[PDB]
Design a protein around this ligand. Structure first.
Ligand code: A1AZR
Ligand code: MYR
Ligand code: MYR
Ligand code: MYR
Ligand code: MYR
Ligand code: MYR
Ligand code: MYR
Length: 582
């Protein structure tokens, strides 16, 4: 194509082109104000329009990396604000773009993004919708410089749909706020998952990444042959490697090529890709990534014929260990879409460890004939935990389920700071909301997906404030041992009770006014502090203090003199609670 900027403008359309140009510049120039970014986007959009009219016009034959880099180097505040980043401008392409990628800031130290009042947001959305939605993209993109720009554009369209529906409703806050909370959580999980996949690829290598992708793709495309799944794994691994390097254009072209290959070979891959493959270039790969699991070939043989009974089990294994183990993963995964990827990797690691020992023996068959008996306890351990926790979640609800988790894990790791225990237990309860709603066959893959971000948040929050050797041990374990290590945590019986502080257990009239989330956090902070002060208190002793606390809040938020009630009845509650647990 003669003018790459014109080709992108025509394939994306004016609306998507402007949104992606704003995201790209916001991610590199994180300190510049919104209005300066609007000026850069208008100048780039107009230049792209002169190139769609006449592809031979001045600068239209330049690469998009050259045009983008040229515009970054016209920024007045470049050396003053970004320092070393202005030195990238003295270099030629491709070294200039490589230099700019290295100087992106993962923590730009910007103020917390404050959600305004609902009436204020709806009035701004009505008066200048165009600016309101571009300010969303600007504020999110500048805070997440490595979030894949077209993925951030999908979240932006869901953000618009929440205001379009809820600002016309009778109760605007009751409609909009649960939608903005769900979107905030899903956006943060998406940002964490994108970073996690790159960190795993770098810290554990290409071999481990490929085994995960074989298991995940075999569950999604069970009718595809092993050779087809293996090729898609190699292509997907290359796409992730170049996407993790950080260049938006190399990443986007890589994803489009893979989506085009999948859409040409649909009969060899899946019967669920017809609608995805008709969608435009921007949506196509995103649609394929979230495609429904295709039905597995009806009438499949037992895994014993190829992996236990056959005479060539150890001959096939020695010939190419990774290929044979990948075939076991493919065969096991396509039959079990209900399993987590890590459970499938544990079964393949168990099967690998077995063949390493048994293939050296004189009669290998006699040594590994009972290998499938070892898989039963590994499969049932996460299945029973999900059933037990989902039946507890159904009985208590998200908030009371979060409270049961707070008491349990404060007793296990009481050295972890109260904000980290509150934050992680609240998110663990949110895992129960998003995954216990799905049926049995969809719960373990969902739980694995959200626990991977929740447990990584716990590990990142813990290493900056390291307090528990056991949390450090579970965080530095292999990926298949992380969750089982945390499940193995014992109650810290040698913890010395924290000294009592009256200010901690003092409540005020503001708890009556606070939002549901801010009110819950206050009570959950006090609950963790109560458990740290009295770690040996039983569930019946803590339940009495929690019921007495609830009745106290019930009474003082109805009283005429609320400030006097919270002060007088609160002194009695704290003293009676200390005596009950003394
Ligand atoms: C089950 C667990 C799900 C939630 C979760 C997921 C992931 C984690 S984590 O692993 O600790 N990681 C993160 C933990 C925190 C963050 N947060 C940030 O970087 C702060 C910036 C940020 O994302 N802000 C944000 C982003 C989106 C939001 N939701 S929103 O509805 O889109 C929104 C955006 C903007 C406004 C208007 C502002 O007007 C001035 C109103 C609503 C909101 C919000 O509603 O307040 C806020 C990012 C990550 C990350 O993924 O890098 C923690 C919790
Ligand atoms: C500046 C212009 C940036 C253009 C980015 C194009 C993104 C296309 C995404 C396609 C895909 O993910 O499959
Ligand atoms: C989300 C941003 C990072 C992108 C990493 C590349 C992912 C490409 C997925 C293409 C779809 C293949 C099928 C599938 O993932 O199930
Ligand atoms: C394209 C196919 C290559 C990948 C095949 C997977 C082979 C290795 C599986 C070993 C068992 C899981 C443990 C691990 O390696 O992390
Ligand atoms: C809130 C907690 C919900 C129940 C979680 C149980 C553990 C499930 C683990 C699945 C992935 C794995 O096998 O490690
Ligand atoms: C805070 C520390 C939490 C560690 C345990 C989380 C592991 C996932 C299983 C959750 C559960 O059993 O409820
Ligand atoms: C030293 C003990 C002082 C008394 C502690 C009172 C605070 C307990 C808070 C418990 C909150 C449980 C949740 C709820 O009631 O909704």
């Amino acid at each position: 194509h003669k003018s790459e900027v014109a080709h992108r403008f025509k394939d994306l359309g004016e609306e998507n082109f402007k949104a992606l140009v704003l995201i790209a510049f916001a991610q590199y120039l994180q300190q510049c104000p919104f209005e300066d970014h609007v000026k850069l986007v208008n100048e780039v959009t107009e230049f792209a329009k002169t190139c769609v009219a006449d592809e031979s016009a001045e600068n239209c034959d330049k690469s998009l990396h050259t045009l983008f880099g040229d515009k970054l180097c016209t920024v007045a505040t470049l050396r003053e604000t970004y320092g070393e980043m202005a030195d990238c401008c003295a270099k030629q392409e491709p070294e200039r773009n490589e230099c700019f990628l290295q100087h992106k800031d993962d923590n730009p130290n910007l103020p917390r993004l404050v959600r305004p009042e609902v009436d204020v947001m709806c009035t701004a959305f009505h008066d200048n919708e165009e600016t309101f939605l571009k300010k969303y993209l600007y504020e999110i993109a500048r805070r997440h410089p490595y979030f894949y720009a077209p993925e951030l554009l999908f979240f932006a369209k869901r953000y618009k749909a929440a205001f379009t529906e809820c600002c016309q409703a009778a109760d605007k806050a009751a409609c909009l706020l649960p939608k903005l909370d769900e979107l905030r959580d899903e956006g943060k999980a998406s940002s964490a998952k994108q970073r996690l996949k790159c960190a795993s690829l770098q810290k554990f290598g290409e071999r481990a990444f490929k085994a995960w992708a074989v298991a995940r793709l075999s569950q999604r495309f069970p009718k595809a042959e092993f050779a087809e799944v293996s090729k898609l794994v190699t292509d997907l691994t290359k796409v992730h490697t170049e996407c993790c390097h950080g260049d938006l254009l190399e990443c986007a072209d890589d994803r489009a090529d893979l989506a085009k290959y999948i859409c040409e070979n649909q009969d060899s891959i899946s019967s669920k890709l017809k609608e995805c493959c008709e969608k435009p270039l921007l949506e196509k790969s995103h649609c394929i990534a979230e495609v429904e699991n295709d039905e597995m070939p009806a009438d499949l043989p037992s895994l014993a014929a190829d992996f236990v009974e056959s005479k060539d089990v150890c001959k096939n294994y020695a010939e190419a260990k990774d290929v044979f183990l990948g075939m076991f993963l493919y065969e096991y995964a396509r039959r079990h879409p209900d399993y987590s990827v890590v459970l499938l990797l544990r079964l393949a690691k168990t099967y690998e460890t077995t063949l390493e020992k048994c293939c050296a023996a004189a009669d290998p068959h006699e040594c590994y004939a009972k290998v499938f008996d070892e898989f039963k306890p590994l499969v049932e351990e996460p299945q029973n935990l999900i059933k037990q926790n989902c039946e507890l979640f159904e009985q208590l609800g998200e908030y009371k389920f979060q409270n049961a988790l707070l008491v349990r894990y404060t007793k296990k790791v009481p050295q972890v700071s109260t904000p980290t225990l509150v934050e992680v237990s609240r998110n663990l309860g949110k895992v129960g909301s998003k995954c216990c709603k799905h049926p049995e066959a969809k719960r373990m893959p969902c739980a694995e997906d959200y626990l991977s971000v929740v447990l990584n948040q716990l590990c990142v929050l813990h290493e900056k404030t390291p307090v528990s050797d056991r949390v450090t041990k579970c965080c530095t374990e292999s990926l298949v041992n992380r969750r089982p290590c945390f499940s193995a945590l014992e109650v810290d019986e040698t913890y010395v009770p924290k000294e009592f502080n009256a200010e901690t257990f003092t409540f005020h009239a503001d708890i009556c006014t606070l939002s549901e989330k801010e009110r819950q956090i206050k009570k959950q902070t006090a609950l963790v502090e109560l458990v740290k002060h009295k770690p040996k208190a039983t569930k019946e002793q803590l339940k009495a203090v929690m019921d007495d606390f609830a009745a106290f809040v019930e009474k003082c938020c109805k009283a005429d003199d609320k400030e006097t009630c919270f002060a007088e009845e609160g002194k009695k509650l704290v003293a009676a609670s200390q005596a009950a647990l003394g």
